[PDB]
Design an enzyme around this catalytic site. Structure first.
Site, PDB file in Angstrom:
ATOM      1  NE  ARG A   1     -50.926 -40.844  -9.204  1.00 25.64           N
ATOM      2  CZ  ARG A   1     -49.471 -40.865  -8.832  1.00 25.64           C
ATOM      3  NH1 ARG A   1     -49.547 -40.530  -7.632  1.00 25.64           N
ATOM      4  NH2 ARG A   1     -48.789 -41.182  -9.582  1.00 25.64           N
TER       5      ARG A   1
ATOM      6  CB  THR B  30     -43.063 -38.045  -3.180  1.00 24.54           C
ATOM      7  OG1 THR B  30     -41.897 -39.117  -3.148  1.00 24.54           O
ATOM      8  CG2 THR B  30     -44.253 -38.653  -2.277  1.00 24.54           C
TER       9      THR B  30
ATOM     10  CB  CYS C 124     -39.988 -37.740   4.356  1.00 23.47           C
ATOM     11  SG  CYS C 124     -39.065 -37.830   2.854  1.00 23.47           S
ATOM     12  CG  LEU C 125     -35.521 -41.773   6.625  1.00 23.51           C
ATOM     13  CD1 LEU C 125     -35.356 -43.167   6.306  1.00 23.51           C
ATOM     14  CD2 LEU C 125     -34.574 -41.032   7.702  1.00 23.51           C
ATOM     15  N   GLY C 126     -35.926 -38.696   2.914  1.00 27.39           N
ATOM     16  CA  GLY C 126     -35.405 -38.179   1.634  1.00 27.39           C
ATOM     17  C   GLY C 126     -35.761 -36.657   1.510  1.00 27.39           C
TER      18      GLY C 126
HETATM   19  C1  HEM Z   1     -41.532 -34.041  -2.383  1.00 24.11           C
HETATM   20  C2  HEM Z   1     -41.552 -35.284  -2.101  1.00 24.11           C
HETATM   21  C3  HEM Z   1     -41.879 -36.009  -0.776  1.00 24.11           C
HETATM   22  C4  HEM Z   1     -42.611 -36.168   0.085  1.00 24.11           C
HETATM   23  C5  HEM Z   1     -44.064 -35.116   0.071  1.00 24.11           C
HETATM   24  C6  HEM Z   1     -42.377 -37.110   0.947  1.00 24.11           C
HETATM   25  C7  HEM Z   1     -43.224 -37.725   1.829  1.00 24.11           C
HETATM   26  C8  HEM Z   1     -43.230 -38.687   2.784  1.00 24.11           C
HETATM   27  C9  HEM Z   1     -44.010 -38.685   4.042  1.00 24.11           C
HETATM   28  C10 HEM Z   1     -45.564 -38.306   4.216  1.00 24.11           C
HETATM   29  C11 HEM Z   1     -43.583 -39.957   4.506  1.00 24.11           C
HETATM   30  C12 HEM Z   1     -44.311 -40.564   5.957  1.00 24.11           C
HETATM   31  C13 HEM Z   1     -45.439 -41.498   5.764  1.00 24.11           C
HETATM   32  C14 HEM Z   1     -45.817 -42.213   7.016  1.00 24.11           C
HETATM   33  O1  HEM Z   1     -45.552 -41.749   7.784  1.00 24.11           O
HETATM   34  O2  HEM Z   1     -46.261 -43.301   6.483  1.00 24.11           O
HETATM   35  C15 HEM Z   1     -42.326 -40.271   4.074  1.00 24.11           C
HETATM   36  C16 HEM Z   1     -41.485 -41.230   4.152  1.00 24.11           C
HETATM   37  C17 HEM Z   1     -40.477 -41.637   3.526  1.00 24.11           C
HETATM   38  N1  HEM Z   1     -39.582 -40.943   2.459  1.00 24.11           N
HETATM   39 FE1  HEM Z   1     -40.365 -39.387   1.758  1.00 24.11          FE
HETATM   40  N2  HEM Z   1     -41.280 -37.716   0.735  1.00 24.11           N
HETATM   41  C18 HEM Z   1     -40.629 -37.201  -0.460  1.00 24.11           C
HETATM   42  C19 HEM Z   1     -39.662 -37.574  -1.230  1.00 24.11           C
HETATM   43  C20 HEM Z   1     -38.897 -38.569  -0.801  1.00 24.11           C
HETATM   44  C21 HEM Z   1     -37.538 -38.973  -1.461  1.00 24.11           C
HETATM   45  C22 HEM Z   1     -36.983 -38.219  -3.000  1.00 24.11           C
HETATM   46  C23 HEM Z   1     -36.942 -39.848  -0.918  1.00 24.11           C
HETATM   47  C24 HEM Z   1     -35.871 -40.807  -1.303  1.00 24.11           C
HETATM   48  C25 HEM Z   1     -35.836 -41.241  -2.368  1.00 24.11           C
HETATM   49  C26 HEM Z   1     -37.967 -40.407   0.099  1.00 24.11           C
HETATM   50  C27 HEM Z   1     -37.714 -41.255   1.201  1.00 24.11           C
HETATM   51  C28 HEM Z   1     -38.750 -41.622   2.021  1.00 24.11           C
HETATM   52  C29 HEM Z   1     -38.406 -42.937   3.135  1.00 24.11           C
HETATM   53  C30 HEM Z   1     -37.272 -43.791   2.859  1.00 24.11           C
HETATM   54  C31 HEM Z   1     -39.595 -42.859   3.897  1.00 24.11           C
HETATM   55  C32 HEM Z   1     -39.758 -43.880   5.186  1.00 24.11           C
HETATM   56  C33 HEM Z   1     -39.243 -43.454   6.352  1.00 24.11           C
HETATM   57  C34 HEM Z   1     -39.651 -44.293   7.524  1.00 24.11           C
HETATM   58  O3  HEM Z   1     -40.703 -45.073   7.313  1.00 24.11           O
HETATM   59  O4  HEM Z   1     -39.189 -44.507   8.734  1.00 24.11           O
HETATM   60  N3  HEM Z   1     -38.962 -39.225   0.223  1.00 24.11           N
HETATM   61  N4  HEM Z   1     -42.137 -39.707   2.866  1.00 24.11           N
HETATM   62  C1  LIG Z   2     -47.236 -42.617   1.527  1.00 27.62           C
HETATM   63  C2  LIG Z   2     -45.894 -42.669   0.933  1.00 27.62           C
HETATM   64  C3  LIG Z   2     -45.577 -41.128   0.716  1.00 27.62           C
HETATM   65  C4  LIG Z   2     -44.849 -43.284   2.218  1.00 27.62           C
HETATM   66  C5  LIG Z   2     -43.313 -43.265   1.502  1.00 27.62           C
HETATM   67  C6  LIG Z   2     -43.797 -43.386  -0.190  1.00 27.62           C
HETATM   68  C7  LIG Z   2     -45.507 -43.734  -0.065  1.00 27.62           C
HETATM   69  C8  LIG Z   2     -46.123 -43.892  -1.349  1.00 27.62           C
HETATM   70  C9  LIG Z   2     -45.491 -45.054   0.916  1.00 27.62           C
HETATM   71  O1  LIG Z   2     -45.644 -46.057   0.556  1.00 27.62           O
HETATM   72  C10 LIG Z   2     -44.970 -44.810   2.311  1.00 27.62           C
HETATM   73  C1  LIG Z   3     -41.537 -40.462   0.514  1.00 23.79           C
HETATM   74  N1  LIG Z   3     -42.183 -40.579  -0.818  1.00 23.79           N
END
Ligand code: HEM
Ligand SMILES: CC1(C)[C@@H]2CC[C@@]1(C)C(=O)C2
Ligand SMILES: [C-]#N
Ligand SMILES: [K+]
Length: 405
Positions: A177, A243, A348-350
């Site tokens: 943002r 996020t 999402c892995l988290g």
């Molecule tokens: C409520 C919060 C969260 C939401 C809504 C969220 C949402 C997302 C989404 C939409 C993606 C995929 C984006 C794409 O396809 O380009 C993503 C990827 C990922 N998220 Fe989250 N996330 C959340 C919290 C977290 C947390 C707490 C962690 C860990 C600290 C995390 C780690 C990751 C990672 C490592 C990926 C990349 C995986 C890959 O590209 O293979 N996320 N997340």
């Molecule tokens: C769009 C996303 C939620 C996804 C994980 C963090 C984020 C801001 C990225 O840059 C890839």
């Molecule tokens: C996932 N941010």
């Protein structure tokens, strides 16, 4: 600022939506994006804003696009194009099969096994932060809980000093943002400048923190490079500081304005986990996309190689075609459909860590502060971008209605 309409784009598909400043923002960010799902809007439209790009408006197309990485590549996942091109985080900027090896290592620092290990610290911090605010009868939720709760847990996991939060938080916000003072590329460089010296230091003296594990990790049996490690840690910083932080504010804002839903969770605590899912659907907040690897006919629309397409994870769950009365929040909703945590190979892995922080927050907050509301005359304003959020959320309550325990 509208870019000239590309030659292959028909005028009937033009819908000038600004993902960074939607015209209906004052009614709530989710409501602002939902305008793309009105009766007269096609399933796939082209906006001339932010350099020009496609936008999938329905869950059916969004899910399909995310599954088809051969045509929809993550090599350029952000809009505008300059941001997407500079974006090189791992493994978000990679497509299968090369992406998989890195995703495995990432899962090692944020996967479920790590959540179980943090279980105690997460629970402890939530209770501590809330108990401290309880007697005050008021708080600025965004900076008093929404930020410090998730961020301190992340900083501990990554072994970084809490005093570095202000700077790191500013940089990550510029990537999702931007206020205009920094381009995505400038924010990325600043982020890398911060991490480079840290990565080398931990590759020399390996620790147990997330950064050390990544820096000294292996990718499919071979040593990870400093460059690759840098690109992975950069993603971690962004996912750890944005996020969850923003999602907690959308949820608490809703609870503050809905005494009936708070009561429901107080009388039936066993519905909290299900409520978390319904909130994840209603207040979905992410919106990134992909780039076309070649010319391709998608649902009757001709897309050209290099075209950018925004695939709002946020819109799948708001699609009336996936959930009747989408804007309505019902914790008893039978089949909660959404793509809040993404779809496809980049799922999402988290999410396991996110759900834990959300559920713990709901339980521990309602247990101590069952009664509260938006501060008198306060007008909650949202902000739109790759990750939408709440600018501020001033809350108030009567201390005599709280219970310390
Ligand atoms: C409520 C919060 C969260 C939401 C809504 C969220 C949402 C997302 C989404 C939409 C993606 C995929 C984006 C794409 O396809 O380009 C993503 C990827 C990922 N998220 Fe989250 N996330 C959340 C919290 C977290 C947390 C707490 C962690 C860990 C600290 C995390 C780690 C990751 C990672 C490592 C990926 C990349 C995986 C890959 O590209 O293979 N996320 N997340
Ligand atoms: C769009 C996303 C939620 C996804 C994980 C963090 C984020 C801001 C990225 O840059 C890839
Ligand atoms: C996932 N941010
Ligand atoms: K790129």
């Amino acid at each position: 600022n509208l870019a000239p309409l590309p030659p292959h784009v028909p005028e009937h598909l033009v819908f000038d939506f600004d993902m960074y400043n939607p015209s209906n923002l004052s009614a709530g960010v989710q409501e602002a994006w939902a305008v793309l799902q009105e009766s007269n809007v096609p399933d796939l439209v082209w906006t001339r804003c932010n350099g020009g790009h496609w936008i999938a408006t329905r869950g059916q197309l969004i899910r399909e696009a995310y599954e088809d990485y051969r045509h929809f590549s993550s090599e350029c996942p952000f809009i505008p194009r300059e941001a997407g091109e500079a974006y090189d985080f791992i493994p978000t900027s990679m497509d299968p099969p090369e992406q998989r090896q890195f995703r495995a290592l990432a899962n090692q620092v944020v996967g479920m096994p790590v959540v179980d290990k943090l279980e105690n610290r997460i629970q402890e911090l939530a209770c501590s932060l809330i108990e401290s605010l309880r007697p005050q009868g008021q708080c600025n939720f965004t900076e008093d809980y929404a930020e410090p709760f998730p961020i301190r847990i992340f900083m501990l996991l990554a072994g970084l000093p809490e005093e570095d939060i202000p700077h790191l938080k500013y940089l990550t916000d510029q990537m999702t943002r931007p206020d205009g003072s920094m381009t995505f590329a400038e924010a990325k460089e600043a982020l890398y400048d911060y991490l480079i010296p840290i990565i080398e230091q931990r590759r020399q003296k390996p620790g147990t923190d997330a950064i050390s594990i990544v820096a000294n990790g292996q990718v499919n049996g071979r040593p990870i490079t400093s460059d690759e490690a840098k690109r992975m840690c950069g993603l971690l910083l962004v996912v750890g500081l944005d996020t969850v932080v923003n999602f907690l504010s959308f949820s608490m804002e809703f609870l503050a304005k809905s005494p009936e839903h708070r009561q429901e969770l107080i009388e039936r605590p066993e519905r909290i986990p299900a409520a978390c899912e319904e909130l994840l659907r209603r207040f979905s907040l992410v919106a990134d996309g992909r780039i076309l690897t070649s010319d391709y006919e998608f649902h009757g629309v001709q897309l050209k190689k290099g075209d950018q397409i925004l695939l709002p994870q946020m819109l799948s769950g708001l699609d009336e075609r996936e959930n009747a009365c989408p804007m309505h929040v019902d914790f008893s909703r039978q089949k909660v459909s959404h793509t809040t945590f993404g779809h496809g190979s980049h799922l999402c892995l988290g999410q396991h860590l996110a759900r834990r922080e959300i559920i713990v927050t709901l339980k521990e907050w309602l247990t101590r502060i069952p009664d509260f509301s938006i501060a008198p005359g306060a007008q909650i304003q949202h902000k739109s971008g790759i990750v939408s959020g709440v600018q501020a959320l001033p809350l108030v309550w009567d201390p005599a209605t709280t219970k310390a325990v």
